[PDB]
From Swiss-Prot, chain A:
Homotetramer. Component of the heterotetrameric polycystin channel complex with PKD1; the tetramer contains one PKD1 chain and three PKD2 chains. Isoform 1 interacts with PKD1 while isoform 3 does not. Interacts with PKD1L1; probably forms a Ca(2+) channel. Interacts with CD2AP. Interacts with HAX1. Interacts with NEK8. Part of a complex containing AKAP5, ADCY5, ADCY6 and PDE4C. Interacts (via C-terminus) with TRPV4 (via C-terminus). The keyword Ion transport applies. Detected in fetal and adult kidney. Detected at the thick ascending limb of the loop of Henle, at distal tubules, including the distal convoluted tubule and cortical collecting tubules, with weak staining of the collecting duct. Detected on placenta syncytiotrophoblasts (at protein level). Strongly expressed in ovary, fetal and adult kidney, testis, and small intestine. Not detected in peripheral leukocytes. Forms a nonselective cation channel. Can function as a homotetrameric ion channel or can form heteromer with PKD1. Displays distinct function depending on its subcellular localization and regulation by its binding partners. In primary cilium functions as a cation channel, with a preference for monovalent cations over divalent cations that allows K(+), Na(+) and Ca(2+) influx, with low selectivity for Ca(2+). Involved in fluid-flow mechanosensation by the primary cilium in renal epithelium. In the endoplasmic reticulum, likely functions as a K(+) channel to facilitate Ca(2+) release. Residues 24-233, 292-317, 385-396, 412-419 are extracellular. The gene is PKD2. Belongs to the polycystin family. This is Polycystin-2. Ca(2+) 1 binds at L406. The chain holds residues 219 to 694 of 968 of the full protein. Phosphorylated. Phosphorylation is important for protein function; a mutant that lacks the N-terminal phosphorylation sites cannot complement a zebrafish pkd2-deficient mutant. PKD-mediated phosphorylation at the C-terminus regulates its function in the release of Ca(2+) stores from the endoplasmic reticulum. Cholesterol binds at Q322.
Curated annotation (Swiss-Prot), chain C:
Glycans are attached at N80, N103, N137, N150. This is Polycystin-2. The chain crosses the membrane at residues 2-23, 244-264, 281-301, 328-348, 373-394, 430-450. Cholesterol binds at Q332. It is found in: Cell projection, Cilium membrane; Endoplasmic reticulum membrane; Cell membrane; Basolateral cell membrane. Residues 265-280, 349-372 are cytoplasmic. Belongs to the polycystin family. It comes from the Eukaryota.
Amino acid sequence: SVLRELVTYLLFLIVLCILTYGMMSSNVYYYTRMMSQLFLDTPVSKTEKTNFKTLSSMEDFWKFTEGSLLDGLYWYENLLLGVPRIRQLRVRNGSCSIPQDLRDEIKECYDVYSVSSEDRAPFGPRNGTAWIYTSEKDLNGSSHWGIIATYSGAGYYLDLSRTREETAAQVASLKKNVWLDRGTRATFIDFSVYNANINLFCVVRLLVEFPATGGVIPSWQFQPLKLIRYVTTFDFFLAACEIIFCFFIFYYVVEEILEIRIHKLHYFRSFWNCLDVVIVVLSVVAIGINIYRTSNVEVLLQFLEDQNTFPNFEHLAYWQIQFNNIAAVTVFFVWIKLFKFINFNRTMSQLSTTMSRCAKDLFGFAIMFFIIFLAYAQLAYLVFGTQVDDFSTFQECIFTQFRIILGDINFAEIEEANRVLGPIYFTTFVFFMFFILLNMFLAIINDTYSEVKSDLAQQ
Amino acid sequence: SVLRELVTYLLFLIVLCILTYGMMSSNVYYYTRMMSQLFLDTPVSKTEKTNFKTLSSMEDFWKFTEGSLLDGLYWKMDNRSFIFYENLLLGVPRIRQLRVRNGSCSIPQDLRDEIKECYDVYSVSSEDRAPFGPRNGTAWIYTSEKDLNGSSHWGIIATYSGAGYYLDLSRTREETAAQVASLKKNVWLDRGTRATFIDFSVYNANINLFCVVRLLVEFPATGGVIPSWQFQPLKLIRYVTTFDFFLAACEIIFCFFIFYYVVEEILEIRIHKLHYFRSFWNCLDVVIVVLSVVAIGINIYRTSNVEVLLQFLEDQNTFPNFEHLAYWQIQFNNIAAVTVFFVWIKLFKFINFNRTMSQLSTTMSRCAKDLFGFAIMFFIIFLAYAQLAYLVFGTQVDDFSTFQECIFTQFRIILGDINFAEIEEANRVLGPIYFTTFVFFMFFILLNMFLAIINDTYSEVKSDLAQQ
Amino acid sequence: SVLRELVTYLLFLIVLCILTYGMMSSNVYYYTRMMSQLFLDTPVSKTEKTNFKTLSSMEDFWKFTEGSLLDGLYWKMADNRSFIFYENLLLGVPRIRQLRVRNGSCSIPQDLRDEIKECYDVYSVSSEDRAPFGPRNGTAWIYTSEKDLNGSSHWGIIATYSGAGYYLDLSRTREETAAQVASLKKNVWLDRGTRATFIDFSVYNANINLFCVVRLLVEFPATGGVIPSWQFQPLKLIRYVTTFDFFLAACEIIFCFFIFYYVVEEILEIRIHKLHYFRSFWNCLDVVIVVLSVVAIGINIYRTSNVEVLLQFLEDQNTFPNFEHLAYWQIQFNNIAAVTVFFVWIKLFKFINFNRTMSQLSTTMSRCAKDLFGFAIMFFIIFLAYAQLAYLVFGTQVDDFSTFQECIFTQFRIILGDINFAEIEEANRVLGPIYFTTFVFFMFFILLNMFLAIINDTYSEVKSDLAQQ
């Protein structure tokens, strides 16, 4: 009856497990450590200890862009794959309204970054393309969604060279004619690498944000890509597994459309059918991303030998990230669907009936729990927001509250920032979470279990 | 009926949130962060690895003042000083110490033949009010609290006063260094010194936000140094942008809501339903109204009491007195945060839109007199353990040095965030006994008693409402 | 009536708190912290990063004695006194003392009596050396008895040492203590037979009225290595100075009167009425409190009445102040007072019955104690089985299971999640993960829930019985 259904699903599960195991051991994560450590951890020179992880000004950034960058870009032992690009976004003088109370000394004001306040005039000597505005369309750029703002794709860009002898000269020329004024608000550096020692790709992005209050906020992201081809037999086995998984999910969506065709009258009143639909949509988006990257990985090999043109390879990294994050939740949902099927004996029948008969009550109390949770998170944001660095943003406040529930409290800066109303908040939060609120879920489950056992016994 | 109350409560909550996050400028953290990293983490000199956070003596303070402070204060492009090329230093900084007099404490007659001086711990009754050193300037002459425009501080060791021996520094670096060198030559920090303060302010005209800095160094009566700091941003030129006018309009609307709520509360307390505090929502409304009125009072008091800013602006070569404004800003922020928390908690009055939520609310309500009655006993045991820990470990751990610190350590014990390598070496017996018994009684007795009360109450409430 | 008992207990509690928290006065934590940071955390020299807390050999100890110790002891301004923080006065001179064992004090196998020549046992009073050695000139090379040294046993980490040994009294200035220590180092003073070394001194700090007694102990185990330990204790020996001291004395007298009254009342209530008197748990608490209080009073009387060492020091202040027994008895008195305060606060449960909510909870606890004891026997038997298995398997490798008590402490910490599974997995790749996983699973899934089952059953039973009746 359900033997085939269970069997098909079990077959489907082992295919996913094999694919994940093949994906879990790509020997790439080691490579990304040992490639990021070259740029973000090597001092700028033999004298200073400053690196990209701990930038603190503009002069050290100028030191970094001629030095620890060129030193690690031309010499694990990766090599270049084209020409890199440096771009900046900046605001315009007079973007503010200085209060009339004090204007005899404050002559220049630059607002925080925004599209309305962005500068478009040609500044400095108009010799090249770094001293003139180019729109987002002309650069084929997109948003970045940085730390303190979101940055567009336009700006003042300049493509570097393939030989360090000329890249150093041109970056020194850009340093001589002052390029990073007070209005500079962000700076991007991008390039691509091959590392011919091991066949594995990567695209890099380096960001420096200049706040209106002084200082720098360095940010980075490394995302490798794979050019997997028919090399070994295990690769052939994985490819065959991928193909049979594509056919299996095709069959599965056929049965799903059949289910929604004959049983269209009611298909969302059950919790499991929603699981099936989310699983199938995540699977289809994952396979779409996979086929997209497989189609587009062949375009990029033109830059391996010699091409003096910047390769625009950020969408590949974005979609690789999305693909990984979709695959993780997909396999989690598949394992939960497996957890559904265990209803063989009377004991498991009682357990499943108990878990199913107390779903609306648990959902109902989740609302109260999260109302209290977000009230506490908002209190923490309003009290420690400016000082602690663990509560600087609302979502970071929520994450810190979840970590505190799992016993990862600090309480050092919490008490230092506010000697009263900080300890009060911590003690009340701990007392109410660990003794009162979290026990309501258990109370609901206990009462439902007792009711189910009594009902079956009297039946 | 209830819909009108719900919608007016929703509008009140919306305007309150808009007010709170209007003055909660995004990414204001990095301004104070850069200031702290500049004035705290910087080593006092190129050779030394000591900074302000790790001061341990008085020569360390003298090296810091002539070192990291004069580097982080004065920048070159009587010209002005821009800290990060954006932050402008307003006026001059001020340094001020508090002293005690020889003879404030008495030496026993047994040891009077080898110990002469005796300086008490800091107190107002034992404070030095006499000139000393080369008595020519204001750094060697006592100036009272009112003649100096100060107030109490409440440091770590004690609560210091607003008087003492002060000196207003200069606008440039060349002569400020000379002033500090002269204060170092003629000994300014003797054995009598009990505290020292440094204050200054910056503007950063890009955003419209002042910053007030205070660095406190306490010299305890046993020897040593306890450093402290405080960076607080302020906004005193509010009306600059259109969003500021929007915020002012929301402020007026919020005052209108608070007045309406006060009128209704007086009406419902004076004649109708006298002594109606038997409910919970009424008490919650009273707390919210009282907190809102206190916040409005503070805002009214310190929204037009900005004549210190005008007095600085008419002559910018003086010390800007912005400490009271920072203190009242901090108090206002605390009151507003608590008010927002309680307004959010009030939302439970309206979530009864089905049977499940109503049943959950009833179960949570009917277990209020039992959980409170057992929380009394829980806290009796908790405070007994805290007292024992204070009496045993209060001299040597740093986590039990004060009673409140003892209480905080215990809530942290439950989360497993302890050392136990310092509890066990502080007292080899009665330390492990403490830890073992505390863990056993917290996890195996009282937690299960809380859960038992909750379980029994939920079952009884559900059964009785279902049967009725 | 009950109000009389309540008010008398409240007055007793108030007096006891006044006394104990007057002893725990304004921050002496910083007084202790300054000294400990000055001596323990100061690196032995400019280049090396070694401090007293991380000694590893004999040469490290010799660097510490000639290095950070003299710098932290003697401060500058004719051979004047040294004020440690310009405020703490070094009293008299410090003393250094060691313990030794005899050459050939063990048993070595006859199959190696030509390969192994010298042997020194672990420390024991039957194995300690008592003969002159080296350049037998002064008191550093001649054994001096415990009675002649006015000392006592210390109970260090490894063993309980004696009050005797080879001692030397240092000087009042750096230029002479340095020479004395250099002469001790040249004519080798620390051989392989050394088993311990002590350093003692005291300071005053007249700004407050509080002595500090410091002892630094370094043990050399028979298997090699160094184990450092320390002890900083503040004392008040000149009590009556200010008016608050007179207030504390009056409170002391009042507390003694309360203890006498309680003793006579409990004696007259155990004389005839209720000759058993012990099956109440409140009478047991009363007698526990009375016994602890009279022990504390006796210790206080027999330690304060003996400040004769202070007088002897005050006659001539170029001698070693012998404030060791005073610090020891101060520590004992502090422990007894802390426990007494704990139990007096716990006795407050006798009066919180003002309504039904507290009454039913107290009844629930009383009626569940009898079953929780029965289950706790089994819980602790299983706990001790796990502890002994961990001691026997991981005891020689992990450093967290070296002794049975350490195994119990480690298991209680594991219950909190304060453990490092990597260290216990490396020691034994099999039976390590099994022990940890099975312990966590059975402790949290089975043992922690039977307690809840019993508590909930008894609570529901008593609530329903009261409601029905």
